[PDB]
Design a protein around this ligand. Sequence first.
Ligand SMILES: *[C@@H]1O[C@H](CO)[C@@H](O)[C@H](O)[C@H]1NC(C)=O
Ligand SMILES: *[C@@H]1O[C@H](CO)[C@@H](O)[C@H](O)[C@H]1NC(C)=O
Ligand SMILES: *[C@@H]1O[C@H](CO)[C@@H](O)[C@H](O)[C@H]1NC(C)=O
Ligand SMILES: [Cl-]
Ligand SMILES: [Cl-]
Length: 604
Amino acid sequence: CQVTNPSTGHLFDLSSLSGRAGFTAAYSEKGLVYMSICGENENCPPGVGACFGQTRISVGKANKRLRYVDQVLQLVYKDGSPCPSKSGLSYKSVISFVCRPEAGPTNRPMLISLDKQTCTLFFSWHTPLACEQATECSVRNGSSIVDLSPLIHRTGGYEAYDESTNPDFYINICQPLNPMHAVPCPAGAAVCKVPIDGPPIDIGRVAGPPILNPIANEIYLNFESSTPCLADNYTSLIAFHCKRGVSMGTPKLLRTSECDFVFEWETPVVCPDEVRMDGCTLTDEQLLYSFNLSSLSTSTFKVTRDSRTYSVGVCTFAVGPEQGGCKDGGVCLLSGTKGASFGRLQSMKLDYRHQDEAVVLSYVNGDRCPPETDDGVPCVFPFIFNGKSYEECIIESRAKLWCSTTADYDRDHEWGFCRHSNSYRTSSIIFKCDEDEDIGRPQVFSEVRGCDVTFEWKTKVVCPPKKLECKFVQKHKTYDLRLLSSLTGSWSLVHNGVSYYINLCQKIYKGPLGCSERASICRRTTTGDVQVLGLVHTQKLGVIGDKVVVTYSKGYPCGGNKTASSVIELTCTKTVGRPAFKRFDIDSCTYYFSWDSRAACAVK
Ligand SMILES: *[C@@H]1O[C@H](CO)[C@@H](O)[C@H](O)[C@H]1NC(C)=O
Ligand SMILES: *[C@@H]1O[C@H](CO)[C@@H](O)[C@H](O)[C@H]1NC(C)=O
Ligand SMILES: *[C@@H]1O[C@H](CO)[C@@H](O)[C@H](O)[C@H]1NC(C)=O
Ligand SMILES: [Cl-]
Ligand SMILES: [Cl-]
């Protein structure tokens, strides 16, 4: 019940599998196959390794004859019962063992395909017991390693595009292809080709580790074949080009050079980790001041909803060296026994949300999102089935990978065949402004299909310019408006009984009730309510032909997402003048004010 390697002489032992009680594989829906390893199965006639379900049909007589075929441990069960094809022709089974380092509940035998012509049953079993070395899905780059491991497909395989709904190519990278429903890909294959017309041909086998280009750097990956070309053994190649973003990106076919297959894969994982331009601070061109989020980075936060507890870090890993769950992860859904990373801290992006005055931190590229059923109803992890708790799609009493849709299958019997996700998990915090939240505390805002999390965090950190500089430069000329910026009260013009209150670079002080805080320019209709015409923090300064212009946005609601605005223009004069009213542009909803001032005049 053992075989060794012709080139290394490594030991393989399948004694741990040699049960008399054996195991069960499925074919069709309610069809079953009972089988033992290196011995006859107690559910079959004496001297038979595997047989058909209800009707004990010998699909092969048991033996210890274990062949090693290219990284794969292969058994053959010969001289089974008569075959429908011709007289005396025996049924035969090919139980083949493919390597897989991870254990897990899907380490079980399966019919991958059935040749009806030659009565050959094709089986595959995925075991750590069949592994010889380690999974080499990384190559060293200078001081830090580059690691393709998260791209490893662990349930099936990547499907390559329909070039010049039917399948075509199949791909996994550092472990071989997983068993696939009605896809007769040969056991142990890494890269597979399915032709409409023709039994699927092996074109790629996981050769060595990824290789590194020391120049304008990309990453390659060689794949081999024992199956021969129609002009010469087929070769296969995946080139990796770095592309940042949410999608980890499937491989696509590029060149076809006939005895050679070349692919291309655009992926975040190949990108160098980039030290952030300006640390834990958000800076936008449009407002030119900035927020310092560092005071939050100071520690992690445990946010929780419906028993789901996330640990969240701002500019620091979600989990220190203690829970040790989400490697690299900046947000982490703690499941005690584990952790799911909802985005790599390194991938962090900070973007100002102009529409909302809010700041959006976003981590990306965590762990794969969970599967749903074929009919699109989400899986529930963990679930109980046959009195055991499962955390992933299983193959038990069924032909294809399936999950439960309740916490307790045994009780509720609801389920569906898994269709797997392709998005890896994202998270984001949206930072909203609140003056008396010194450092706030995030809460859960939205969760979608266990694939994204968004928190709302109200800090003081993302608020505070109520005071601004009036020293700016345009085309090498410096103007100093600090003269007109009153630290005590404001300026007021009365135009047509309507009072206007206006203060440069600063909050209006002792303003009329209705003039909010932050209000840079105000308006009070004779006996009517008052209207904010602009806010100080949205200040814009500039020069237009001899005039110094100052702009304020985000005033009162002006119909159809329009908001009031104020534009004050200043020609240079001798005095420190008073502001006057010019016009109110109806279409833009903008107020134009005149000011002759000594302030609008650069000097040296
Ligand atoms: C490897 O490391 C160097 C130095 O850190 C960096 O410039 C380069 O972009 C990295 N990328 C790869 C995958 O070679
Ligand atoms: C395919 O080619 C390799 C060398 O390139 C050779 O070792 C092998 O025997 C060939 N095919 C088979 C039978 O594996
Ligand atoms: C943000 O605050 C921190 C305190 O941890 C300080 O070290 C950092 O320099 C500040 N960032 C700015 C304003 O650049
Ligand atoms: Cl196993
Ligand atoms: Cl505090």
